[PDB]
Amino acid sequence: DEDIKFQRENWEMIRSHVSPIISNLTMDNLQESHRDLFQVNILIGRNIICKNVVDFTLNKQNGRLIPALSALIALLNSDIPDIGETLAKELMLMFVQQFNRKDYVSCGNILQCLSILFLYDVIHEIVILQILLLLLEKNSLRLVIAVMKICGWKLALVSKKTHDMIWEKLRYILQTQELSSTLRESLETLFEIRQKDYKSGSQGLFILDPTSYTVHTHSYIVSDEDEANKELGNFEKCENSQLQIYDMTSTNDVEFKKKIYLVLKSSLSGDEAAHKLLKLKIANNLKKSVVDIIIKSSLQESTFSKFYSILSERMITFHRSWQTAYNETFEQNYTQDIEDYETDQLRILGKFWGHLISYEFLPMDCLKIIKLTEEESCPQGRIFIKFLFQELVNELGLDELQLRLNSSKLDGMFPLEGDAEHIRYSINFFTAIGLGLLTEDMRSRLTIIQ
Amino acid sequence: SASHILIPASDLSWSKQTDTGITHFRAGMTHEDEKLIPTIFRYITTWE
């Protein structure tokens, strides 16, 4: 037959689609695990989906992924109340079997599965607490405490009178009865969470609204028959308006520039100017824009001042994001903005950066970006190096400056590797500055080559 | 204006013995929280 044929590989693929969904169910993937399941025929594949979730819960690999598992079942239950109807039936029989088998591993697998079904309003309260009576009839205490850690949140919200009486009966055992040792600290841990109020047992995937889940609170008990419809999991033979205004005005960036300029101009000292900037609590994406205003306020002066340098150091030693805005601004000043600046403004820049480089608020490795070349050195860029290095010589002294230029590996300033016309350029640069003592290593390499 | 600034404040017992630095500020002359007045000292080149 081709009709018995077609209905079998249709029955095969429906099996072969649900099982990779159930294996690939995780948090932040529930709605997509629900999407590809909804296009699969759940109504025909009714025990195909029931046997895939019950076996995957029980495997003891899971136990962590139970709160994601029941969240799909609640997505099923509001779509179809009949899907979770049989799926709530089998988990009752699974416990009633394995409790009479005394299977503590497989019971507590189901016992965490049923409690999160109650948290997701799949099952009633009466099915849960009547399990809690049959567990509290014998010992079974390593099972029943793991239930009441998870289920006791919602259950004390709904059925608080009966649920206290269970707490009332359970408390009789710890006080006036001898028990085993290792289970004893499990019994009193259940009373330790009562006073901390269950804030470590109520986190999960409530991914339906309290009305978006059509509330099919099934009123089962574990004392009734549940019909065991295993005959569906086999094969059978069916004869069946925002207005997007572009803003070119940039009033916002002008109004923020006035606020920062006024913080600076109202301050006596740079310690008190940095305090007011740190008080504003500027966002991370605006901090590069703040270092840019501070430098442009400083170049409007006639001379350098310690105010802008003292203020800058207070921001860098506050938090490492202000450190990053100063490392980013030093490259913007050298690579983009050099052409814009007049010679009087390059005195204030090189003394500003050379002061922060010499007291180590910037690394000496920030000078790595600088490359001395006939072709790729700006005339206004070379005026920046002279003013930055005159400041480094004055603060450190020349003998201390040779220690730090040796410790860094900056090749564009001091090339020892070749290209002998560039070695000619650098020695000629630094002796014009007044630093021939720095050049003496490069002077050896040139006479060898010529 | 010279006195809308925040004034530096420190522990007075320690300050007589060693320079403590600036750890606290007190208020100078009162204004609204957003509303600063510039000070003459920021407009004068220092002698050095």
Partner: peptide, 27 residues
Amino acid sequence: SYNGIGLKSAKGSSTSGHVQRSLASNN
């Protein structure tokens, strides 16, 4: 807390006496 910092009063002072800890002070 007061912690030995501040004016004894804001009465002869012409100020309000409001003190704040400096955020630019590293420690």
